Design an enzyme around this catalytic site. Sequence first.
Site, short mmCIF file in Angstrom:
data_model
loop_
_atom_site.label_atom_id
_atom_site.label_comp_id
_atom_site.label_asym_id
_atom_site.label_seq_id
_atom_site.Cartn_x
_atom_site.Cartn_y
_atom_site.Cartn_z
N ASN A 135 -7.65 9.43 -5.59
CA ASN A 135 -8.48 8.52 -6.41
C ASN A 135 -9.29 9.26 -7.45
O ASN A 135 -9.53 10.45 -7.33
CB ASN A 135 -9.43 7.70 -5.50
CG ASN A 135 -8.67 6.90 -4.43
OD1 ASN A 135 -8.96 6.97 -3.21
ND2 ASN A 135 -7.71 6.14 -4.88
N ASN A 180 -9.00 5.41 3.19
CA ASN A 180 -9.63 6.26 2.20
C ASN A 180 -10.54 7.33 2.84
O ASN A 180 -11.33 7.03 3.71
CB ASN A 180 -10.42 5.38 1.23
CG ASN A 180 -11.12 6.17 0.13
OD1 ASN A 180 -12.33 6.30 0.13
ND2 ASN A 180 -10.36 6.70 -0.79
N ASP A 223 -6.33 8.48 -0.35
CA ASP A 223 -5.86 7.45 0.58
C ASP A 223 -4.66 7.96 1.37
O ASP A 223 -3.78 8.62 0.83
CB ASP A 223 -5.46 6.19 -0.18
CG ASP A 223 -6.58 5.62 -1.06
OD1 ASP A 223 -7.78 5.81 -0.81
OD2 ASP A 223 -6.24 4.95 -2.02
N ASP A 228 -12.47 9.27 -8.04
CA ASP A 228 -13.64 9.89 -7.46
C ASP A 228 -13.36 11.15 -6.63
O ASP A 228 -14.28 11.72 -6.07
CB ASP A 228 -14.47 8.87 -6.66
CG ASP A 228 -13.83 8.46 -5.32
OD1 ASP A 228 -12.64 8.72 -5.06
OD2 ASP A 228 -14.52 7.87 -4.49
N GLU A 268 0.81 -1.23 0.00
CA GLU A 268 0.00 0.00 0.00
C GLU A 268 0.85 1.28 0.00
O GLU A 268 0.54 2.23 -0.70
CB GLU A 268 -0.96 0.00 1.20
CG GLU A 268 -2.08 -1.10 1.10
CD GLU A 268 -3.15 -0.76 0.02
OE1 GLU A 268 -3.18 0.40 -0.45
OE2 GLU A 268 -3.95 -1.65 -0.35
N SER A 308 -11.65 11.22 -3.81
CA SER A 308 -11.24 10.82 -2.48
C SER A 308 -9.69 10.67 -2.42
O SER A 308 -9.04 10.65 -3.47
CB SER A 308 -11.98 9.55 -2.01
OG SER A 308 -11.61 8.42 -2.79
#
Length: 129
Positions: A46, A59, A52, A48, A35, A50
Site C-alpha cells: 500500500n 493489512n 496486505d 502508506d 481480493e 503497509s
Amino acid sequence: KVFGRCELAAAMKRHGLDNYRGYSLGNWVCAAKFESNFNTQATNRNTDGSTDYGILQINSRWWCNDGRTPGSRNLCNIPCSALLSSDITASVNCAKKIVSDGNGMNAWVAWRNRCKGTDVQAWIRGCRL
Ligand SMILES: [Cl-]
Ligand code: NA
Ligand code: NA
C-alpha cells in the site's frame, strides 16, 4: 496454494464462516475472489508502506506483524507470513476478529465495491457443501 471456488467454500464452512456475524458463505468466497483470486500467497503493498497478505488480503497496519510497518499494531497476534499458508486457519481466525470490529465486511474494499448488493449465493452455486 490457489483454491478452487468450491474447495474454498467448503474449507471456509468448516472453519465457521457461513453466517459468521450474519454474512452468508457466498460473501466470503466473493471477497476472496476479488481480493486475491483465491491465492493464499497474494501480497500487495500500500501507499502508506503497509502490506496486505493472503487470501483475504489482511493489512499489516493493524492486524499482523511483518517487521516493516513502523508504528503498526498486531491485533491478530500473528506474523503476516502465517497468512500466506495453504492452511487458511490463521487467515480465517483473523478475518473473524476484523469483521466483528464495527464496519463488518466493509473493511474489505473489494467486497464493498464488487460483492455487496450482488447475488453472492452464485459464488457457492453447484458446490457440495
Ligand atoms: Cl455487519
Ligand atoms: Na451465500
Ligand atoms: Na512492524
